[PDB]
Amino acid sequence: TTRTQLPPAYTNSFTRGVYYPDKVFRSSVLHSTQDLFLPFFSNVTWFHVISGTNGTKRFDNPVLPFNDGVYFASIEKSNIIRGWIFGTTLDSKTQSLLIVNNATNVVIKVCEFQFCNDPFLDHKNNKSWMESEFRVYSSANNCTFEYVSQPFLMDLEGKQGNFKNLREFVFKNIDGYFKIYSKHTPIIVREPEDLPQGFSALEPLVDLPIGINITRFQTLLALHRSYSGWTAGAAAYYVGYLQPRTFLLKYNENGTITDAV
Amino acid sequence: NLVKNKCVNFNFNGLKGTGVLTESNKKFLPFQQFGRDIADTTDAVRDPQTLEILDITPCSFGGVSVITPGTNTSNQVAVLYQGVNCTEVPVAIHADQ
Amino acid sequence: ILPVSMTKTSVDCTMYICGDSTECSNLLLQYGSFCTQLKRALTGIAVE
Amino acid sequence: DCALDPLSETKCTLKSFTVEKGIYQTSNFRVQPTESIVRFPNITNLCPFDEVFNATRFASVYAWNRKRISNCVADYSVLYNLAPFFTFKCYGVSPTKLNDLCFTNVYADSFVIRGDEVRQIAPGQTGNIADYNYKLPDDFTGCVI
Amino acid sequence: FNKVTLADAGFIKQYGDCLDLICAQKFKGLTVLPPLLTDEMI
Numbered sequence: 001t002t003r004t005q006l007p008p009a010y011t012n013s014f015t016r017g018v019y020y021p022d023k024v025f026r027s028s029v030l031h032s033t034q035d036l037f038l039p040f041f042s043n044v045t046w047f048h049v050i051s052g053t054n055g056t057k058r059f060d061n062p063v064l065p066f067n068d069g070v071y072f073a074s075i076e077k078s079n080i081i082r083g084w085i086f087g088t089t090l091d092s093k094t095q096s097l098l099i100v101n102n103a104t105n106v107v108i109k110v111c112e113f114q115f116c117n118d119p120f121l122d123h124k125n126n127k128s129w130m131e132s133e134f135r136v137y138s139s140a141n142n143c144t145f146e147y148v149s150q151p152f153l154m155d156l157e158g159k160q161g162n163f164k165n166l167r168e169f170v171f172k173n174i175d176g177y178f179k180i181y182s183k184h185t186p187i188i189v190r191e192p193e194d195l196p197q198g199f200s201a202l203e204p205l206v207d208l209p210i211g212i213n214i215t216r217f218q219t220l221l222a223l224h225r226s227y228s229g230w231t232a233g234a235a236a237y238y239v240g241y242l243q244p245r246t247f248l249l250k251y252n253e254n255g256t257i258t259d260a261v
Numbered sequence: 262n263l264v265k266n267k268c269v270n271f272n273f274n275g276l277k278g279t280g281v282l283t284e285s286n287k288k289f290l291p292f293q294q295f296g297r298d299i300a301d302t303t304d305a306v307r308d309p310q311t312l313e314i315l316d317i318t319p320c321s322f323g324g325v326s327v328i329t330p331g332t333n334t335s336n337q338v339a340v341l342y343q344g345v346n347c348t349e350v351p352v353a354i355h356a357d358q
Numbered sequence: 359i360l361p362v363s364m365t366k367t368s369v370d371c372t373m374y375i376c377g378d379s380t381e382c383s384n385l386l387l388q389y390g391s392f393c394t395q396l397k398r399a400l401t402g403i404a405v406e
Numbered sequence: 407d408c409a410l411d412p413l414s415e416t417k418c419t420l421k422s423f424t425v426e427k428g429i430y431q432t433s434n435f436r437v438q439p440t441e442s443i444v445r446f447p448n449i450t451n452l453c454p455f456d457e458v459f460n461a462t463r464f465a466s467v468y469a470w471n472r473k474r475i476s477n478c479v480a481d482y483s484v485l486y487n488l489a490p491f492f493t494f495k496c497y498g499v500s501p502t503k504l505n506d507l508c509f510t511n512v513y514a515d516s517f518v519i520r521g522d523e524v525r526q527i528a529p530g531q532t533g534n535i536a537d538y539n540y541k542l543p544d545d546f547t548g549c550v551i
Numbered sequence: 552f553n554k555v556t557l558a559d560a561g562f563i564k565q566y567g568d569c570l571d572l573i574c575a576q577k578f579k580g581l582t583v584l585p586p587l588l589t590d591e592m593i
């Protein structure tokens with residue numbers, strides 16, 4: 001629709017954005033490494049996606065520059081945030097990524113597509129036919145890489161309310177590799193303003209050997225219908241850029257990062 | 262990938278080293294593969310076949326010393342093996358030592 | 359309080375530098391006796 | 407000598423024929439390895455790559471089928487052993503140890519061949535069917551199968 | 552002795568109980584020789 005622009009806000013990242021550098025297990029040792037890391041207490045945007053103007057779609061999905069990595073996270077309650085499409089020019093002439101969560105399959109694809117002006121998804125499954133969610137693209141020319149496996153998210157919600165997800169993700173591409181780190185934990189208070197102060201370690205999940213040149217970042221939304229236009233619930237996500245740093249890491253007896261400096 | 266109680270060379274993930282592979286009590290995380298110590302040396306490894314990890318300790322090695330009264334007055338000598346269990350190095354180890 | 363003695367230590371060059379490498383032992387052999395001075399000094403230190 | 411007896415090694419280290427009373431360090435001892443623990447990544451999979459090679463139909467020369475071998479451990483020595491598979495020689499890589507050496511992004515093609523143009527599908531010459539339908543780059547990769 | 556013992560040579564020189572700072576460095580050619588006079592003779 002004819003929605004208006006929204007000036008992005010800022011929030012302090014606190015002591016978050018630390019991951020396991022290597023697969024090697026080390027315990028009770030204070031190892032120091034040189035790698036890209038999120039600086040402690042840095043500004044991070046706190047984009048919040050909610051029902052805009054009581055029924056007006058909000059296109060708060062900018063083409064954020066990928067640069068050297070991201071610290072995508074969320075305080076998501078129900079399943080509304082999906083898609084981490086990437087693109088140099090975001091057209092049919094550019095190889096692009098698309099990380100869907102179709103049922104229980106990631107369906108990782110590396111093919112050229114044409115992207116709608118405001119692509120989106122339906123959180124509720126379409127009746128009868130499979131789903132009209134493939135509206136994001138209409139043409140697929142050439143295909144390089146395909147990957148189908150278990151869904152990248154193992155978060156459950158059907159249990160009960162009063163607790164939401166705290167999905168955290170780091171997207172890093174270097175020397176023809178693509179690594180994804182994830183970690184989930186429950187939440188105590190519904191405070192959407194700032195990130196709670198707690199240490200979290202981002203374990204590697206999937207590694208890809210593709211060599212796509214990535215420069216921009218795009219996010220998709222899951223809205224079914226007015227349940228005017230396309231509307232959904234409340235959600236919030238953060239973007240944290242990654243820059244080189246030097247850290248001193250302290251391991252525990254079990255080999256899990258407890259704190260770092 | 263399996264043998265126990267004998268320090269042997271291996272090619273675990275390209276690593277070529279010799280040590281006494283034995284049972285381990287470390288609780289590796291599901292993704293973790295290799296083990297290290299304070300001196301930054303391999304200490305434990307992930308089992309390829311199973312999910313029970315093993316410890317690597319190099320087998321016994323050390324230096325020898327010779328105690329002699331002086332070649333004058335007898336040539337009898339005694340041999341001291343520094344810092345090793347006597348049971349681990351009896352007089353019958355000459356087959357593999 | 360006055361210090362009196364310290365720890366007696368011994369270092370094996372061949373194993374420390376080239377741990378389990380016969381080719382390394384043959385190559386180190388061309389240097390002569392580069393380890394007798396260290397061993398003698400350490401033994402003297404221990405005796406001292 | 408310097409290996410007959412402890413007195414011999416003591417004399418060898420002292421570089422003298424006479425030894426006084428005392429304790430001397432001569433050499434070290436190390437337990438040698440006994441066997442090999444064989445080593446295996448314990449991979450449990452075999453590539454389903456025979457579907458493209460053998461199927462109901464073969465792709466035409468003017469329209470090759472698009473299929474690639476990825477995340478596979480497909481053995482090529484069984485192909486070398488197979489009598490029908492007579493071409494296993496490799497111009498730029500190992501003919502018989504091609505499978506053992508690691509590689510990535512292997513692409514497959516299907517094209518009908520008369521039989522006498524196999525020598526001409528390679529770069530540098532034009533075959534009866536390779537003049538207009540099939541081709542290879544200036545320095546073709548892979549091996550002829 | 553209780554005040555000084557936060558770190559010492561380990562008191563261990565049999566090497567049998569090593570399965571971790573000294574014996575692990577033992578695999579790197581750093582050994583400790585025992586004193587001639589024990590602490591009960593001193």
Ligand SMILES: *[C@@H]1O[C@H](CO)[C@@H](O[C@@H]2O[C@H](CO)[C@@H](O)[C@H](O)[C@H]2NC(C)=O)[C@H](O)[C@H]1NC(C)=O
Pocket residue numbers: 252253254255286287288289
């Ligand atoms: C990891 O730290 C725990 C500390 O809790 C160590 O002890 C474990 O404690 C939990 C919770 O009390 C028990 O459920 C486990 O059975 C304990 N493990 C035991 C007794 O072996 C644990 O040993 C540490 N693990 C490592 C590898 O250091």
